Amino acid sequence: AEAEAASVRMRGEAEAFAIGARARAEAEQMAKKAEAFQLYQEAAQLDMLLEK
Amino acid sequence: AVEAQEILRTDKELIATVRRPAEAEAHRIQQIAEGEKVKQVLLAQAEAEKIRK
Q1: Buried b / exposed e across A3-42, counting CB within 10 Å, b at 16+?
Q2: In whole angstroms, what is the distance from residue B9 CA to residue B16 CA?
Q3: Which phi and psi angles does A41 have, rounded to 5°?
Q4: Cβ of B9: how many Cβ atoms within 10 Å?
Q5: How many interface pairs between A and B have CB atoms less than 8 angstroms apart?
Q6: Is there a contact between B46 and A2 (Cβ–Cβ < 8 Å)?
Q7: Within 10 A of B53 (CB to CB), how many other CB atoms are there?
């Protein structure tokens, strides 16, 4: 039982740290998405609408 | 007198036949019950700490 508990603890901690890693990556990723979207005029919105 | 001696003999025979085996059976049952109780208590403790961990 102690071995199983340690296994669960360590695997869960590792996967939670991995979730945090993608979290930080995705946040720093979306910041630049917003920054790029800020420089969109009517032509770009028209392109997005006609692509969708 | 034949039957009186038979009474004494059958008294002793009934003793040796059922009175002492009853006591031995009682001792066996209580010993085995002690063993089973200790086993169940230990298993329950193991399961409880399993659940806790």
Answers
A1: eeeeeeeeeeeeeeeeeeeeeeeeeeeeeeeeeeeeeeee
A2: 11
A3: -95, -170
A4: 10
A5: 7
A6: no
A7: 13
Q: Which residues of A touch B45 (CB under 8 A)?
A: none
Q: Of the candidates A39, A8, A12, which has an alpha carbon nearest to the alpha carbon of residue B50?
A: A8
Give me B14's structure tokens. 């009934």
Report the largest interatomic distance among the alpha carbons of chain A, rounded to a whole angstrom: 64
Q: What are phi and psi of A40, to 5 degrees?
A: -120, 125
Structure-determination technique:
cryo-EM
Task: Give me the amino acid identity at B13.
Answer: E
- Hey, is the C-beta of B46 within 8 angstroms of any chain A C-beta? yes
Place of tokens 């910041």: A31
Resolution of the structure, angstroms = 3.6
- For B47, nearest residue in chain A (alpha carbons): A1
